[PDB]
Design a protein around this ligand. Structure first.
Ligand SMILES: OC[C@@H]1[C@@H](O)[C@H](O)[C@@H](O)c2[nH]cc[n+]21
Length: 483
């Protein structure tokens, strides 16, 4: 590469006073990824198609009709990837297992070739001293199940998921001691079924059809039951023998009141309710948020008594995926007519106060750089939910995809991002938050869902022509801070 690639960035060596000794004994630092975003071999090695394979087929879905058939090809270059992880000082890797790579049809026939891949992967991490954190679901429902009964929209999914979970616990649990059932069921439900932005692209006006007033609530409900059903398998059959732990990964945008009024304060709490409460209130309290029940009414399913008991306390810890924050305003008087889950929040978003933007915007349209947001979010979870064990399970930011190696590696904006967010995380911990780990999204630039390869989130740059890896300055910033 060009000489400027090798300029030594002084920011690499400013850890902002952070080290392992600024965190609890045993605190875990890792990176996070997902099966579809990094594996490749989408249509090979036995893997049956998922909803994203079909979704991607519609022209104009991914920019430049790009695909994840290869992406960064972690399927073949996992040893290199794990080696970078170890060399940069990380303790852990949160990956996901692909459901349809294990069960090409979602239920029934096991794909032994898929099982073999995950065994290779996990065994290699253990060999190198990287702790495996396995996530069971990251947007990749087997297409068959969507075809049979529309996947998350059917109560049939619950036992289908629990069986897949069961198999994974049986198969991988001798060395995986850290499980998550779902990555961000709120996005699975909202992007899948409210605005159709993600697979299977259902919504009120969408080509695929759908109903934004009802389907996201149906989906969310079945995701919760599926989580609880899977955890029940874990607890009853595996937990006391494998001695591991199981949680869920929940996204949480911080919602800050725009002003001190009762109205704006209530708006911010209302947003938290619909964004996080939706899943965390059932799991901690066995019930939905009050605001949701009153606003959404008949459109929300209800839990039976049995269901409520299965759902309550169905985690050993909660993963919080946190990136960004917004101001929240009371939007005036509310219609009235059901329109969508997002509309049901009855809030106004604001991105600046007194001419000052809440923060700089990263590449992604939704990502505003607001480090103090991570402190408020974690503290809120501490105060609202009885100080549960937490993992800060995703955090990072993106550069535009169209940049050269030479430019891509000097990501001092990302160094600032981490220094500042990790610093604000430390404060919330120092103040009592029971956070036991932190994971950066992501090790490698990868397939960014609807943004394709126009968004680079990695701390390692990937040349998509050659699949060669180039650690960015931020990787070295971690390496330095972690020793
Ligand atoms: O947008 C960057 C990343 C995605 O790539 C991940 O798959 C997803 O877990 C997520 N949630 C919030 C931000 N992100």
């Amino acid at each position: 590469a060009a000489p400027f690639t090798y300029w030594l960035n002084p920011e690499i060596y400013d850890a902002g006073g952070l080290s392992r000794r600024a965190f609890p004994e045993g605190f875990v630092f890792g990176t996070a990824a997902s099966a579809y975003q990094v594996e490749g071999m989408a249509k090979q090695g036995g893997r049956g198609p998922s909803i994203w394979d079909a979704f991607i087929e519609k022209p104009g879905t991914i920019p430049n009709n790009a695909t994840a058939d290869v992406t960064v090809d972690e399927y073949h270059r996992y040893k290199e990837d794990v080696n970078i992880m170890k060399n940069m000082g990380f303790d852990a890797y949160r990956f996901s297992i692909s459901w349809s790579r294990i069960f090409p049809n979602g239920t029934g026939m096991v794909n032994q070739e898929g099982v073999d891949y995950y065994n290779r992967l996990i065994d290699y991490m253990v060999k190198k001293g990287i702790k495996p954190y396995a996530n069971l679901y990251h947007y990749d429902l087997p297409l068959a199940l969507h075809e049979q009964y529309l996947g998350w929209l059917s109560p049939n999914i619950v036992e289908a998921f629990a069986d897949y979970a069961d198999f994974c616990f049986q198969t991988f649990g001798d060395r995986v001691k850290d499980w998550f059932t779902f990555n961000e069921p709120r996005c699975v439900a909202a992007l899948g079924y409210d605005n159709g932005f993600h697979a299977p692209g259902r919504c009120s006006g969408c080509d695929a059809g759908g109903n934004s007033t009802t389907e996201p609530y149906l989906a969310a409900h079945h995701l919760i039951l599926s989580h609880a059903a899977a955890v029940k398998r874990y607890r009853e059959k595996y937990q006391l023998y494998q001695k591991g732990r199981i949680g869920i990964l929940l996204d949480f945008v911080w919602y800050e009141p725009f002003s001190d009024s009762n109205a704006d304060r209530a708006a911010a709490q209302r947003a938290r309710d619909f964004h996080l409460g939706w899943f965390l209130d059932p799991i901690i309290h066995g019930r939905y948020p009050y605001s949701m029940l009153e606003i959404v009414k008949d459109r929300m399913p209800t839990f039976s008594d049995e269901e409520s008991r299965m759902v309550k306390d169905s985690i050993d810890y909660v993963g919080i995926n946190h990136y960004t924050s917004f101001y929240m305003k009371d939007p005036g008087p509310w219609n009235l007519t059901p329109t969508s889950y997002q509309d049901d929040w009855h809030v106004g978003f604001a991105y600046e106060r007194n001419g000052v933007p809440i923060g700089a915007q990263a590449n992604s349209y939704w990502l505003y750089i607001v480090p103090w947001g991570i402190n408020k979010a974690v503290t809120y979870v501490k105060e609202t939910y009885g100080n549960p064990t937490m993992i800060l399970s995703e955090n990072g930011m993106d550069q535009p995809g169209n940049v050269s190696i030479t430019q891509g590696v000097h990501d001092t904006v990302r160094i600032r991002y981490y220094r500042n967010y990790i610093t604000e995380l430390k404060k919330a911990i120092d103040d009592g938050a029971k956070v036991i780990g932190y994971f950066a999204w992501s090790l490698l630039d990868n397939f960014e869902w609807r943004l394709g390869y126009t968004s680079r989130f990695g701390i390692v740059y990937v040349d998509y022509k050659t699949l060669k890896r180039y650690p960015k300055d931020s990787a070295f910033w971690f390496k330095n801070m972690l020793s």
